[PDB]
Design an enzyme around this catalytic site. Structure first.
Site, mmCIF file in Angstrom:
data_model
loop_
_atom_site.group_PDB
_atom_site.id
_atom_site.type_symbol
_atom_site.label_atom_id
_atom_site.label_comp_id
_atom_site.label_asym_id
_atom_site.label_seq_id
_atom_site.Cartn_x
_atom_site.Cartn_y
_atom_site.Cartn_z
ATOM 1 N N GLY A 157 3.022 -6.018 6.096
ATOM 2 C CA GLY A 157 3.367 -7.284 5.716
ATOM 3 C C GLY A 157 3.970 -7.690 4.227
ATOM 4 N N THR A 158 3.237 -7.111 3.148
ATOM 5 C CA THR A 158 3.650 -7.001 1.838
ATOM 6 C C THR A 158 4.906 -6.154 1.784
ATOM 7 O OG1 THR A 158 1.314 -7.808 0.989
ATOM 8 C CG2 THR A 158 2.895 -6.788 -0.592
ATOM 9 N N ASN A 161 7.644 8.333 9.274
ATOM 10 C CA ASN A 161 6.359 8.874 9.089
ATOM 11 C C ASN A 161 6.267 9.700 10.210
ATOM 12 O OD1 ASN A 161 5.106 8.005 7.001
ATOM 13 N ND2 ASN A 161 3.756 6.635 7.812
ATOM 14 N N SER A 174 7.039 -0.157 2.463
ATOM 15 C CA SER A 174 7.018 0.169 3.768
ATOM 16 C C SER A 174 7.734 -0.623 4.822
ATOM 17 C CB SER A 174 5.473 0.270 4.388
ATOM 18 O OG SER A 174 5.053 -1.009 4.349
ATOM 19 N N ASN A 210 1.952 11.871 1.596
ATOM 20 C CA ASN A 210 2.612 11.608 0.230
ATOM 21 C C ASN A 210 2.918 12.734 -0.494
ATOM 22 O OD1 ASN A 210 2.318 8.761 1.180
ATOM 23 N ND2 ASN A 210 0.500 8.213 0.113
ATOM 24 N N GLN A 269 0.817 -1.071 -0.186
ATOM 25 C CA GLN A 269 -0.033 -0.071 -0.136
ATOM 26 C C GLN A 269 0.696 1.256 -0.114
ATOM 27 O OE1 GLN A 269 -2.987 2.065 3.022
ATOM 28 N NE2 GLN A 269 -2.800 -0.071 3.122
ATOM 29 N N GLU A 323 -3.126 -7.248 -2.622
ATOM 30 C CA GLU A 323 -4.399 -6.945 -2.386
ATOM 31 C C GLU A 323 -4.998 -5.939 -3.496
ATOM 32 O OE1 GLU A 323 -4.984 -4.018 0.061
ATOM 33 O OE2 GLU A 323 -7.077 -4.022 0.246
ATOM 34 N N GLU A 371 26.208 6.461 -9.148
ATOM 35 C CA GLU A 371 26.678 7.494 -8.404
ATOM 36 C C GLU A 371 26.273 7.831 -6.951
ATOM 37 O OE1 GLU A 371 27.235 10.542 -11.519
ATOM 38 O OE2 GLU A 371 28.178 12.151 -10.190
ATOM 39 N N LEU A 389 22.360 5.723 -11.284
ATOM 40 C CA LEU A 389 22.297 5.283 -10.188
ATOM 41 C C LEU A 389 23.516 4.863 -9.262
ATOM 42 C CD1 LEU A 389 19.024 2.837 -10.782
ATOM 43 C CD2 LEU A 389 19.045 5.222 -9.635
#
Ligand SMILES: Nc1nc2c(ncn2[C@@H]2O[C@H](COP(=O)(O)OP(=O)(O)OP(=O)(O)O)[C@@H](O)[C@H]2O)c(=O)[nH]1
Ligand SMILES: Nc1ncnc2c1ncn2[C@@H]1O[C@H](COP(=O)(O)OP(=O)(O)CP(=O)(O)O)[C@@H](O)[C@H]1O
Ligand SMILES: Nc1nc2c(ncn2[C@@H]2O[C@H](COP(=O)(O)OP(=O)(O)O)[C@@H](O)[C@H]2O)c(=O)[nH]1
Ligand SMILES: CS(=O)(=O)N1CCN(Cc2ccco2)CC1
Ligand SMILES: [Ca+2]
Ligand SMILES: [Ca+2]
Ligand SMILES: [Ca+2]
Ligand SMILES: [Mg+2]
Ligand SMILES: [Mg+2]
Ligand SMILES: [Mg+2]
Lengths: 438, 425, 349, 54
Positions: free
Chosen positions: A144-145, A206, A140, A228, A11, A71, A254, A252
């Site tokens: 869990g995912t 956060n 995140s 966000n 998410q 999901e 660098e 990338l």
């Protein structure tokens, strides 16, 4: 030109990704339908914006992105949102049931049955790249995912794309907007299995974004949208060098070179200024010195912590807007005399400066106000390890009683993987201490 | 599409289930015929969690009605929303259970359980992605207690990886039908400890005291008791029936509330609770002080006699979400000696924009407290006062049970009490 | 209701502070591992500053400035004075000092010997002292360096005050202890009450072996000295008596001849490190009680000996000061439902 | 205070200032782990059924 593929997992990763590609499009003059009027080469070209956008014959500029969630309810917004026309359906991958905030469920139980599908879709984006640089993975810690499946993905990417780089944008768990008690478990699990597979990771706490939104934007209870749109402003500042003409952080590779002198210590701290409320009558525009100095105030760091009581291994300033080098050095000299900036003896005491003349783009109707100049400092402080200390502490409190462990063992994970991951963090904290304290 | 299958068994189960379906049917705008007539898109956002959508835009609850006698369910069919239940989901016998756990679990019940699973299986096959089940039942009777647990055991066998959730009415001598209720409750509690992931313990004496003392009802009735259970069931399920972030999933609620598999028995709470000075508005501070007040809880246990493992609060209505966070933090910070220090941030707060019927705002309390052991001691004590004289055992031995089984259930629950005790210190 | 925790059971100061807090009825103590607290009376060594200020809703305060060890360490203090332009290597109120690492381990061995051979050549008093965080006083450089090598920790050698100011009668040495409290706003408050920890042995400059008349430590005077408690009670003369002495004998006040310099020194040290330890824009707040030790020479010039970050208090002053710590350090941040006992030291933040 | 490697283009410029100088698992092993945990899940569920069979 060398392309960059972005992966958004879970998410948090999906929503933050959705808010960055909104900003990317606004910055590069791309419309919701993928058309780009200023692009005078129809259906191709190796411009700087092409590192993030491919092109079709019809003139559509399509993000080099993939969205993966166990999901469907979050990715379903993308499919019907403002920018539904940017992506084709193969880029949006969704499952049936999520990981229920269970690292082991995302990594093992559900991860094993979908990992080969994600790779296949990523391979399709890779086959479009004439010279792929690497990947940017948004996820995140506490989900869990976001935790369990991301580490599994990172393992396979290192197998299928060995000579490629991988950077992380990782959301650090904050109770004020967290929906799980076991997020310390997931954060430490995912750091342990990802550490040897991530070349450079930007941790956003956060807690920091939340309070910046209440202090600077006068938002009493910030939403994810608020959190966000602010996160995508910082991410845009870090990824600008890849999407625009320039000579600093051009690829990338660098980032590791300029920011990470030792592999395990690849977590730079990000500070950003100025953040001004659009609802404000009208603000007095800050100067080059004033915004540079603000880069050493904890109140605008992406992770609260005291760099004064650590040591820097590399410092990098990214300016956007009306900034000339002369003014930057004028501010650095002033800040060196009024601030505690202690590097390590085996590093130069300097700053790599990059300036982009185009000032920060602001989303219409967003919270941020248009400013004449803004800076984002990427500094590799030993002070960021305070976040590890905080997290490891909470781990020890729960694990000492084996609380919630049965949910992980029930998904096929062995209890010893907990202590094995916690011991790794024990070594990580010690590394920072060997580098920072005398 | 995260479907939940509902099951209500026995007299208590069906009477409370019916009212539950009566209450949430109102919140989602469904009339007694299953036709939607709400005014908000939020009512339908997650409507298919508990309802099926037939032809003609009809919404049919995904519930199965079970019982060993036809009486109670005959009433539901005649009740207000009786016509809205799927006729094929009425599965009943004719003999009854005589308030005998062994009849509902071993003899009369076994004869009827297979045809109930035929219905459950048929409802599950039509679910895009089935989360789990929720059962409503009492533990003091025969069907909801004996056959209820029998169903759970067989559901966990055919769906071993789904969430099993129950609303269990615990018996009390003050609000009693028969003297064997401690027998039937002790036997069920062992099945629940083993085969459920979440159990909302509702003590009938708590429901009684709240009607008599708080609501000021001179002579409570089962109907009055079931009003509270309805409101509480509606509240504890707000996370599932509307858009949200926290505990919006059965498995996610378990993962956040159950630090140890066997300790999944919750104390539910509800606020406001006012007699009929009923139109007064309730401030967020007041709404929070009550929700945590023991008098608003329905397990008949004293929270200040144990410690909270985890807590789930849900505030419904249009209110200052900033003012909610302030008060919730004030509760934990002004009484932090009743929360365990080895589970950081064990108190999670969820918000809902839609309020219950007839209330500007309300709060529902879900607590995993070591104080629940006081409930299991009452039942255990009342059990032993009879079993030590083998009193009334003949009702059960006549159904094929042996005293050894009673001795095991007795040991199993005293163990459960000891498990709650080691975590209170 | 405010809450606090106690992580230093050996602190006599904050033990009484905790006694007063509960006496108000508006404070409540918690287990030392409970994160939900308003105020932490933290431990001495390895205080977890990284876990402060991350509790939503709870404003958190702690009684230790992170980074003050730079000032409250022998070798750290010297390194701070020689490198901080605000103090400069030419600091006139700090004895000539050098940091000396034992040979079994930068180090200022050679720099110390240079200034030594200069003094030894100029007929000037060349008595030095060696100590660390066991002290030796000698006039020969060979004995000082050999003493540090026999150990294994960093040491510091600074000039010994050959001409201390002696109290009469007794011809005896002494040192002045002043308590300074810095609150979360970084206001510098000097407790109006000091203490002179005096020696009960006549100062003997021709014998640095018997370290009883040279060391004014309250433990050495009460263990190795034989005149303890003769002149003043517990070798502790307070500002009232010491002031009357400076008048009858020297014809001046403790305010003019000594306290001005003491307040100037306290300002210079604390204002110096303010940018490094200030918690003005920090997610948590800090205050800390400090113990400054000064020497006075026969010219009535004040010298800085060291700063103590967890000092104890004089028995006769535990009530006044501790109650003061609550008024200006804790109540000023968590108020409760004079004639201040402090002397504010205004400065340009 | 030294400026080095100044690069100027139309859309900005970047330089460096030095204030002071200084003083994996193969594909085979991942599949086994994924199947190892899956084997411990099958076992745990068989014990559950074996238990429910008794
Ligand atoms: N900054 C920010 N944080 C988010 C956002 N969405 C979720 N989070 C944080 O992510 C953590 C939970 O992880 P999720 O990403 O929601 O979980 P997941 O990756 O989808 O995995 P599942 O358990 O299967 O749902 C919490 O700490 C949230 O505060 C977002 O949009 N922005
Ligand atoms: N340079 C110097 N000149 C004169 N006397 C000195 C001195 N250095 C130390 N002393 C003597 O030593 C005593 C203080 O020693 P010091 O303070 O270094 O040890 P310490 O820190 O363990 C005692 P405290 O409890 O005050 O911290 C004083 O009484 C003082 O008389
Ligand atoms: N709250 C409530 N409890 C009930 C109700 N009916 C019965 N009970 C309780 O349930 C127990 C009796 O079980 P019952 O449901 O009648 O037996 P069953 O029909 O065989 O399952 C006793 O403890 C009663 O107090 C009711 O309508 N409401
Ligand atoms: C109508 S009654 O027969 O008098 N009555 C006896 C008590 N019994 C249990 C009870 C008490 C309060 C609520 O429920 C309900 C039925
Ligand atoms: Ca083009
Ligand atoms: Ca690699
Ligand atoms: Ca029969
Ligand atoms: Mg998710
Ligand atoms: Mg009945
Ligand atoms: Mg000392």
């Amino acid at each position: 030109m060398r392309e960059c593929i972005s992966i958004h997992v879970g998410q948090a990763g999906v929503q933050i990704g959705n808010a960055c590609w909104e900003l990317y499009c606004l910055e590069h003059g791309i419309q919701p339908d993928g058309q780009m009027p200023s692009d005078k080469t129809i259906g191709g070209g190796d411009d700087s914006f092409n590192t993030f956008f491919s092109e079709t014959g019809a003139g559509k500029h399509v993000p080099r992105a993939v969205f993966v969630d166990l999901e469907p309810t979050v990715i379903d917004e993308v499919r019907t949102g403002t920018y539904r026309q940017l992506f084709h359906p193969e880029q949006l991958i969704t499952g049936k049931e999520d990981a229920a905030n269970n690292y082991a469920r995302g990594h093992y139980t559900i991860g094993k049955e979908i990992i080969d599908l994600v790779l296949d879709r990523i391979r399709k984006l890779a086959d479009q790249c004439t010279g792929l640089q690497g990947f940017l993975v948004f996820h995140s810690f506490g989900g869990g995912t976001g935790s369990g499946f991301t580490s599994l993905l990172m393992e396979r990417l290192s197998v299928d794309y060995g000579k490629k780089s991988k950077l992380e944008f990782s959301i650090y768990p904050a109770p004020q907007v967290s929906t799980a008690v076991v997020e310390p478990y997931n954060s430490i699990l995912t750091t342990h299995t990802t550490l040897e597979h991530s070349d450079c990771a930007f941790m956003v706490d956060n807690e920091a974004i939340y309070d910046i939104c209440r202090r600077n934007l006068d938002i009493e209870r910030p939403t994810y949208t608020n959190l966000n749109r602010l996160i995508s402003q910082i991410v845009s500042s870090i990824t600008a060098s890849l999407r625009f003409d320039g000579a600093l952080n051009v690829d990338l590779t660098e980032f590791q070179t300029n920011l990470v002198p030792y592999p395990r210590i690849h977590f730079p701290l990000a500070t950003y200024a100025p953040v001004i409320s659009a609802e404000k009558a009208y603000h007095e525009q800050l100067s080059v010195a004033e915004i540079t100095n603000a880069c050493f105030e904890p109140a605008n760091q992406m992770v609260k912590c005291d760099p004064r009581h650590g040591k820097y291994m590399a410092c990098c300033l990214l300016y956007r807007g009306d900034v000339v080098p002369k003014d930057v050095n004028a501010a650095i000299a002033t800040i060196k005399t009024k601030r505690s900036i202690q590097f390590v003896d085996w590093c130069p005491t300097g700053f790599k400066v990059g300036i982009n003349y185009q000032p920060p783009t602001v989303v219409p109707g967003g919270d941020l106000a248009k400013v004449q100049r803004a800076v984002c400092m990427l500094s590799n402080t030993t002070a960021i390890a305070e976040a590890w200390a905080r997290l490891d502490h909470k781990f020890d409190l729960m694990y000492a009683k084996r609380a919630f462990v049965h949910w992980y063992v029930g998904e096929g994970m062995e209890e010893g993987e907990f202590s094995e991951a916690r011991e790794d963090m024990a070594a990580l904290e010690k590394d920072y201490e060997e580098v920072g304290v005398d | 599409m995260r479907e939940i299958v509902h099951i209500q068994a026995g007299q208590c189960g069906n009477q409370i289930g019916a009212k539950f379906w009566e209450v949430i049917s109102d919140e989602h705008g469904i009339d007694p015929t299953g036709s939607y007539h709400g005014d908000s898109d939020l009512q339908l956002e997650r409507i298919n969690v508990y309802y099926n959508e037939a032809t003609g835009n009809k919404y049919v609850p995904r519930a199965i009605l079970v019982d060993l006698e036809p009486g109670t369910m005959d009433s539901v069919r005649s009740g207000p929303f009786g016509q809205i239940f799927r006729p094929d989901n009425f599965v009943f016998g004719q003999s009854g259970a005589g308030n005998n756990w062994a009849k509902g679990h071993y003899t009369e019940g076994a004869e009827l359980v297979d045809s109930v699973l035929d219905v459950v299986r048929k409802e599950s096959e039509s679910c895009d992605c089935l989360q789990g089940f929720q059962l409503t039942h009492s533990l003091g009777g025969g069907t909801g207690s004996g056959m209820g647990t029998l169903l759970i055991s067989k559901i966990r066998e055919e769906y071993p990886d789904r969430i099993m959730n129950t609303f269990s009415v615990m018996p009390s001598p003050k609000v009693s039908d028969t003297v064997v209720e401690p027998y039937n409750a002790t036997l069920s509690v062992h099945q629940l400890v083993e085969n459920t992931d979440e159990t909302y313990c509702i003590d009938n004496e708590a429901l009684y005291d709240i009607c008599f003392r708080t609501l000021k009802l001179t002579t409570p009735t089962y109907g009055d008791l079931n009003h509270l259970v309805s409101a509480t069931m509606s509240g504890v399920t707000t996370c599932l029936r509307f858009p949200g972030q926290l505990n919006a999933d059965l498995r996610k609620l378990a993962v956040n509330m159950v630090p140890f598999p066997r300790l999944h028995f919750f104390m539910p709470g509800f606020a406001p609770l006012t007699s009929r000075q009923q139109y007064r508005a309730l401030t967020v501070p007041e709404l929070t002080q009550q929700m945590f007040d023991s008098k608003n809880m329905m397990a008949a246990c004293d929270p200040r006699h144990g410690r909270y493992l985890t807590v789930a609060a849900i505030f419904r209505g249009r209110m200052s979400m900033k003012e909610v966070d302030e008060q919730m933090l004030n509760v934990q910070n002004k009484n932090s000696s009743y929360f365990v220090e080895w589970i950081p941030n064990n108190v999670k707060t969820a918000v809902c924009d839609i309020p219950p019927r007839g209330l500007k705002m309300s709060a529902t309390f879900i607590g995993n407290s070591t104080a629940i052991q006081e409930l299991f001691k009452r039942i255990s004590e009342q059990f032993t006062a009879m079993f030590r004289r083998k009193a009334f055992l003949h009702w059960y031995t006549g159904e094929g049970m042996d005293e050894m089984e009673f001795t095991e259930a007795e040991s199993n629950m005293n163990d459960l009490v000891s498990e709650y005790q080691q975590y209170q210190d | 209701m405010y809450t606090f925790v106690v992580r230093d059971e050996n602190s006599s100061v904050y033990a009484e502070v905790s006694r007063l807090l509960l006496a108000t009825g508006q404070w409540k103590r918690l287990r030392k591992d409970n994160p939900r607290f308003n105020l932490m009376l933290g431990e001495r060594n390895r205080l977890p500053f990284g876990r402060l200020g991350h509790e939503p809703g709870l404003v958190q305060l702690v009684n230790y400035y992170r980074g003050a060890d730079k000032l409250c360490r022998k070798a750290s203090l010297v390194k701070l004075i020689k490198t901080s332009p605000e103090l400069s290597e030419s600091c006139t109120w700090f004895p000539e000092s050098y940091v000396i690492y034992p040979t079994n381990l930068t180090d200022e061995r050679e720099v110390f010997l240079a200034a030594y051979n200069r003094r030894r050549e100029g007929r000037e008093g060349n008595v030095w002292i060696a100590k660390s965080s066991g002290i030796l006083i000698s006039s020969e450089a060979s004995e000082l360096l050999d003493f540090i090598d026999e150990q294994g920790q960093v040491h510091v050698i600074q000039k010994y005050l050959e001409k201390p100011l002696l109290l009469e009668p007794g011809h005896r040495k002494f040192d002045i202890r002043s308590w300074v409290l810095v609150d979360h706003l970084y206001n510098i408050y000097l407790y109006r009450e000091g203490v002179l920890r005096t020696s009960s042995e006549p100062y003997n400059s021709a014998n640095f072996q018997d370290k009883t008349c040279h060391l004014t430590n309250h433990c050495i005077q009460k263990e190795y000295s034989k005149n303890y408690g003769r002149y003043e009670e517990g070798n502790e003369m307070f500002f009232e008596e010491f002031n009357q002495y400076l008048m009858d004998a020297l014809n001046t006040t403790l305010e003019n001849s000594i306290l001005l310099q003491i307040k100037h020194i306290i300002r210079s040290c604390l204002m110096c490190i303010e940018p490094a330890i200030s918690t003005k824009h920090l997610h948590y707040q800090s205050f800390q009680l400090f113990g400054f030790d000064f020497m006075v020479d026969e010219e009535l010039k004040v010298w800085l000996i060291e700063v103590n970050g967890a000092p104890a208090c004089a028995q006769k002053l535990y009530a006044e000061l501790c109650q003061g710590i609550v008024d200006v350090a804790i109540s000023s941040v968590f108020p409760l439902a004079p004639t201040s006992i402090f002397i504010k030291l205004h400065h340009h933040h | 205070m030294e400026v080095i490697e100044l690069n100027k283009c139309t859309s900005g410029q970047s330089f460096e200032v030095i204030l002071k100088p200084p003083s994996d698992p193969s594909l085979e092993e991942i599949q086994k782990k994924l199947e190892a945990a899956e084997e411990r899940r099958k076992y745990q569920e068989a014990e559950l059924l074996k238990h429910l069979a008794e």
